[PDB]
Write a structure and sequence with these properties.
- The structure is cut from a larger assembly and holds 2 copies of chain A.
- By secondary structure, the first copy, chain A, is mainly β.
- Chain A is about 5% helix and about 25% strand.
- The first copy, chain A, contains 5 helices and 28 strands.
- In chain A, strands 1, 2, 5, 6, 12, 13, 14 and 27 form an 8-stranded antiparallel beta sheet that branches.
- In chain A, a hairpin with a 6-residue loop joins strand 5 and strand 6.
- The first copy, chain A, is globular and about 95 Å long.
- At the A-B interface, strand 4 and strand 8 of A face loops of B.
- Chain A: GO terms for molecular function: metal ion binding; structural molecule activity.
- Chain A: Belongs to the parvoviridae capsid protein family.
């Protein structure tokens, strides 16, 4: 049944575990939120452009160019995709510690208890008071995109996904998508004589796509007694591994054989002289086998062009860089460490006066990192003790430029390269992503662990049907309408598959553990606890605590 | 060094003769007939104005 005065749904946020057999777990995560929806600020679609004359007009500022072209819509999307939505911090600890790999299974979603209210103002004498009252006949439009016709638009990009706190209400992300303006921009250094083109092109007859929610899809009209239920969507994806790899290229294979065991705990072991050592190496003209030059099964990780900007018709952009360990060289960019900026709803702390809170995610998987300053290329024919001209060192200048070194432009990717798939991030991390429709596809998307093979889960779009006053002129440029807002509950169920880790190691494994307050380490428990006034903060948890044997 | 005669069977066709190849079936991946305009900088959600 249903109707006004009868609630159409229930609130379940709790997470469940079930053991299907040996090592297997079915993780069923419920999540529910109250969502606050405002009447759209314009009833009609708009094609708008941002263009920076101030930033890009001055020389050398290219990196900050924001210029693009977008289609603004009245619709808003409820985006359930982040890890921080589905799990509470302890459930993330329990999973990160105990399980080798995890995989997505199904997703369900529902909307219920729709409530639309209207606002009037009185009496305007002294100070106005705003009176709130229901419209029982009003409705809310709801459209799900099953076929992914519309441009796929993850909200986590801007951190607009549903809030991470069950008890706080949350808001939708207004739906919008790109349009093709064909920007032109020119390259300069800090102080340079000349001009900068900095122009944007006219609309393209070939490339112009304009989509409309109403034309594209079926819209459900939900009044207070109505409820909407998405069917069960089943993921097809590859599981991801929850245990990090420590094992470098130089740790692969059989170690050399030591001559004899050391006498005392301080003493170092010794090896057969490199001249007489037996092994396999690709160096020519020298009779040696040494731990550095011996042949390894594959390359682990690879050098990458870093802080390079490639420019197609759209404009300059930094190409992605696969997340890899930061070596002791501390250099973040060459290894592609992610850096998030996020607000109080998703993170930060309610005590913080700053507008946003920022965190750099330094990758685990210590095997694939690259120290940039210590990488070097050596001349052929090979020689021990190269003179300066026989070795390519990072300290030298490239093209006569001081701060540009070969490791900037150098690219090692090849058939022999192996790297681990990067890791999920509990708050602020993206759970899944849609695969690009191109024929030749990337081996991984950079931000998202899971990539739906065929068809991604559909986007869920909502808006308030307009409430019109007595006077409505369809030809009028301006539209007067009744001030209106609404609220509704969103409930969803995400099922997962995971497998317990075996532990064969003698020694204790590393684990995620809370720590007493008063010591400054990252895990101090005060940060997961409320304050006196209720200010709460939610910070990224390390993932993949447990080591793994690569080879 | 390959030779047509050594390698293969040759049919001899006079004026009244005709030759017919059997049906050959391709195994291939289809190709997409619609172009993509969408640059790396057009991917994802735009900023909010």
């Amino acid at each position: 049944g249903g109707g006004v005065g009868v609630s159409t749904g229930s609130y379940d946020n709790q997470t469940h575990y079930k053991f299907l057999g040996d090592g297997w777990v079915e993780i069923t995560a419920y999540s529910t939120r109250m969502v606050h929806l405002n009447m759209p600020k314009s009833e009609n679609y708009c094609r708008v452009r941002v263009h920076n004359t101030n930033d890009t007009g001055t020389a050398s500022h290219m990196a900050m160019d924001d210029a693009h072209e977008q289609i603004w819509t009245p619709w808003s999307l409820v985006d359930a995709n982040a890890w921080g939505v589905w799990f509470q911090p302890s459930d993330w600890q329990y999973i990160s510690n105990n399980m080798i790999h995890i995989n997505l299974h199904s997703l369900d979603q529902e909307l219920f208890n729709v409530v639309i209210k209207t606002v009037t103002e009185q009496n305007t004498g002294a100070e106005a008071i705003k009176v709130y009252n229901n419209d029982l006949t009003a409705a809310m439009m709801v459209a799900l995109d099953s076929n992914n016709i519309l441009p796929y638009t993850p909200a986590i990009d801007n951190q607009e996904t549903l809030g991470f706190y069950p008890w706080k209400p949350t808001i939708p992300s207004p739906y919008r998508y790109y349009f093709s303006c064909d920007r032109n921009l020119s390259v300069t250094y800090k102080d340079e004589a000349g001009t900068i083109t900095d122009t944007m092109g006219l609309a393209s007859g070939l490339n112009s796509q304009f989509f409309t929610i109403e034309n594209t899809q079926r819209i459900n009209l939900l009044r207070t007694g109505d409820e909407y239920a998405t069917g069960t969507y089943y993921f097809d994806t590859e599981p991801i591994r929850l245990t990090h790899t420590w094992q470098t290229n130089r740790h692969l294979g059989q170690p050399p054989q030591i001559t004899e065991l050391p006498s005392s705990d301080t003493a170092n072991a010794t090896l057969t002289a490199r001249g007489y050592r037996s092994g396999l190496t690709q160096i020519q003209g020298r009779n040696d086998v040494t731990e550095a030059t011996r042949v390894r099964p594959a390359q682990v990780g690879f050098c990458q062009p870093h802080d390079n900007f490639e420019t197609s018709r759209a404009g300059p952009f930094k190409v992605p860089v696969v997340p890899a360990d930061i070596t002791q060289g501390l250099d973040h960019d060459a290894n592609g460490s992610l850096r998030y900026t996020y607000d109080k709803q998703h993170g930060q702390s309610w005590a913080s006066q700053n507008n946003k809170d920022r965190y750099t995610w330094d990758a685990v998987n210590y095997d694939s990192g690259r120290w940039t300053n210590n990488c070097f290329i050596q001349s052929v024919p090979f020689t021990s003790e190269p003179n300066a001209n026989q070795i390519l060192t990072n300290r030298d200048n490239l093209a006569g430029k001081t701060d540009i070194h070969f490791t900037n432009a150098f690219n090692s990717y090849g058939p022999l390269t192996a790297f681990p798939h990067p890791a999920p991030i509990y708050p602020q991390g993206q759970i899944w992503d849609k695969e690009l429709d191109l024929e030749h596809k990337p081996r991984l998307h950079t931000q998202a662990p899971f990539v739906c093979k065929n068809n991604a889960p559909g986007q869920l779009l909502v808006r308030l049907a307009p409430n019109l006053t007595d006077q409505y002129d369809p030809n009028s440029s301006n539209l007067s309408r009744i001030v209106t807002y609404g609220t509704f509950f969103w409930k969803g169920k995400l099922t997962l598959k995971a497998k317990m880790r075996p532990n064969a190691t003698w020694n204790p494994v590393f684990q995620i553990s809370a720590t007493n307050q008063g010591t400054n380490d990252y895990m101090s428990i005060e940060r997961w606890l409320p304050t006196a006034t209720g200010n709460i903060t939610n910070v990224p948890l390390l993932s993949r605590p447990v080591a793994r044997n690569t080879y």
